[PDB]
């Protein structure tokens, strides 16, 4: 039953001193791999010869490439013992955190096999935004973490019924909007997706302001849209406060319970 | 009393398995034509020989056509029989609901009235997104839709002394900054209406910035807004928040007696 | 003990069928006036030998001049009768609602003295919109707005604290926003004071976007001050969710009380 | 033990009344100097012979000397006697307070020493904002003050866990915001630091529009993303809710338990 001990050892990193040192190797790895990525992405100056500036990740392209090399090292070896030390392959395989390494680290090796053929360009880079939501398994012990995320998912039906809500209201405001709009002198609706972004971004309070209203019709219809985003702002509210003040009794009264 | 049986299908359509079948072939037609008009907002490409590119409604014209026919005896046909199991005519076509779907149905008639001189336009194609209304009915189960929908409605005296209130205060901001801003070159403040906008906008902390204050008095009384805009944001929150608290247990109580 | 029954009609309109009527009349005259400005601000096609459209109360003069004659004519008469059922002249010219009345009536004499010399220009046109304000007396019957009103009165300590913070949090933020942001090149960030305007903007989630931060120094500050921006909206609603909720037992509970 | 009674002053001024007068001083001098140094950034006209319009600080410079000389000189004697009157010189230099005062009183020294070589310029200026952080410790008395703060102080560790999941998102959503948007023309999204600055914006619902997506994967990302800013503003409203009722009834508790 050692197996189970090095699966403990994964689970409970407080356990062992081993698995707590190995547990931080690892958030530290993430974290250098998140940083990584972000820095790769600024662009750098210009060496003699180069027309345009290029990305740390571009002028830099070996030191980055050893880096993510290391990164994935790690990461494939963390992946390996807790596939060898899961109870089960297929349960441990199918939660959604393996899922999320798995297309982390999945990238990588794309590219692997795409080096031969690596002047073609593909989209595996953004997913190595997956990495990110490792770091939320390395802080789940905050005391409030586990309220909020419960309380988030005590509220999926209520929330879940809001986003449906104001998807319809989107629409409807959408299609108001375009139909206003749309014989303004290049205007910005030109459809009802194209105002889409008009609603999405009222109906929230953002108001980038790129597309406004021109018309005097759309400008009364972009302020019931203001108002109806005043009460969208104002609506989760209520649900999330009630659920929360619910769910942080419900703890401490079980917690106390025990005490 | 068969009717009546045609009626409780209606009204249940989770009573027969007839009636959930029509119920969901309903709600797919309502779905498809809601689709069916955005799509047909949408600007496809230019086929040669055109000039500028046609919508996906204006290009495939028949075949929208077509899709809006379908819908409309699909629609029209769920109209004809509720109305005929209607154990009052004038009790039903009085009804919200029924309005929503006449006036839904209505412009593809007045257009079919119109064929012989549909080279004029009207309006009534803005009146196609009443059908979005319809989706509410093929919706009206998530157990916090009913709690939210009934929280807004004891709310319905507090948040329209709220509404009233804050139309006066736009009213009296719009007044301010027209009267700063009236002089300023190139001004888009041109009247009292014009700064309804500005304040609408302002308010709601939307600040698209196309109307902005110029001088020194405009600015002072555009964070005058500002901050009574983060007070319309915060003022229906608690009044929500109660309403909602309030009615949840109310709900849960009256189940659980019943329970 | 008549005059005491005048002041009686005046104080409760329901009381006499006269007083109604009278209460009615005030509150049309009062709408009137506040629609006949923002109408009068509006401005109207021009006639044949002006160059520039002229506002509906610079063509209209003489016709806009007579409905403001007639409302002053109705609120003059009104504040005779108040003063004359006043069970103290001094009491009563004291209140705050019998200055707004007076300065909302007063600018219509001003003009009236200016006549003569009615070529120069006042400012006190903009103090009509305290006629507004008298439309909240009209209006103080919605059994939700004595509580808000009163919520409002309770909080107004905490308020005041957050009001004085946040304009401390608005003084930090704009020297540092200046001091990051003057070297610009065209920047608008001339001043501390130039600053304040950023950072009302900002810290109420706004955002017009006609200041914005050039720098990078400048829009790390603009980070901060966006966060300090969700905090402020997010900081008064407790305060008033409790005491809201407060007031509201209060005031229900004396009157079933009382029931 | 009259070093304890002067020090007993300084921590109570309203024992007696030359600590009272005192701490008046002090706080009228302290507000001296933050008016005058935002008066100091304003840019007043051009003296005959001068091209460009000087700062109230650079025409006024040595009027702005005096004052600042005469605010560093209070504040200088107030700290030596705080120090000759603090039980503990160690106890009292670490306070957050006297390190904050130090560092407000310390530019002015620093610029002394560089009178010789005041041409070159200095960062210490930005420093002076710090004075304005001792208004704090002069209006720590509205009875409201103290309960947020404290409740805030509760709010640590949930409000810190928003703030590492709300940077985790920032992280998330610029990175696919950046590889939207990176291939655009003339596009302002060329680095994931780049695009740092869009999701603040964005999910604070400020939307100052100076960075908008301009493709249809970043609307569609900038729309996700508008609606996390909705969550991100009605998120800390139930922790604060829950932490202010339960803080504002605990103190009410202790102080009628001592009444
Ligand atoms: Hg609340
Ligand atoms: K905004
Ligand atoms: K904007
Ligand atoms: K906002
Ligand atoms: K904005």
Request: charge should be positive.
């Given at each position: 039953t050692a197996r189970q001990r090095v699966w403990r050892a994964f689970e409970?990193?407080?356990?062992?001193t081993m698995a707590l040192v190995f547990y931080y190797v690892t958030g530290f790895f993430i974290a250098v791999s998140v940083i990584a990525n972000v820095v790769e992405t600024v662009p750098c100056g210009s060496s003699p010869g180069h027309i345009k500036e290029l990305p740390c990740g571009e002028r830099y392209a070996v030191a980055f490439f050893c880096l993510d090399t290391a990164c994935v090292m790690i990461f494939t070896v963390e992946y390996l013992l807790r596939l060898a030390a899961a109870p089960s392959r297929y349960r441990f395989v199918r939660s959604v955190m393996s899922i999320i390494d798995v297309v982390a680290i999945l990238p990588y090796y794309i590219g692997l096999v795409m080096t031969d053929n690596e002047d073609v360009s593909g989209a595996?880079?953004?997913?190595?935004?997956?990495?990110?939501?490792r770091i939320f398994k390395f802080s789940?012990?905050?005391?409030?973490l586990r309220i909020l995320g419960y309380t988030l998912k005590s509220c999926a039906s209520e929330l879940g019924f809001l986003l449906f809500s104001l998807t319809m209201a989107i629409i409807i405001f959408a299609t108001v909007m375009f139909y206003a709009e749309?014989?303004?002198?290049?205007?910005?609706?030109?459809?009802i997706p194209a105002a889409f972004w008009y609603t999405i971004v009222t109906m929230t309070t953002?108001?980038?302001?790129?597309?406004?209203?021109?018309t005097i019709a759309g400008k009364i219809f972009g302020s019931i849209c203001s108002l109806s985003g005043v009460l969208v702002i104002a609506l989760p509210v209520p649900v999330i406060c009630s659920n929360f003040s619910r769910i942080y009794h419900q703890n401490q009264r079980a917690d106390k319970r025990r005490a």
């Open positions: 409970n990193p407080h356990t062992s595996f880079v953004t997913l190595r935004v997956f990495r990110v939501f789940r012990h905050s005391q409030g749309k014989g303004s002198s290049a205007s910005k609706f030109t459809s953002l108001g980038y302001g790129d597309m406004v209203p021109k």
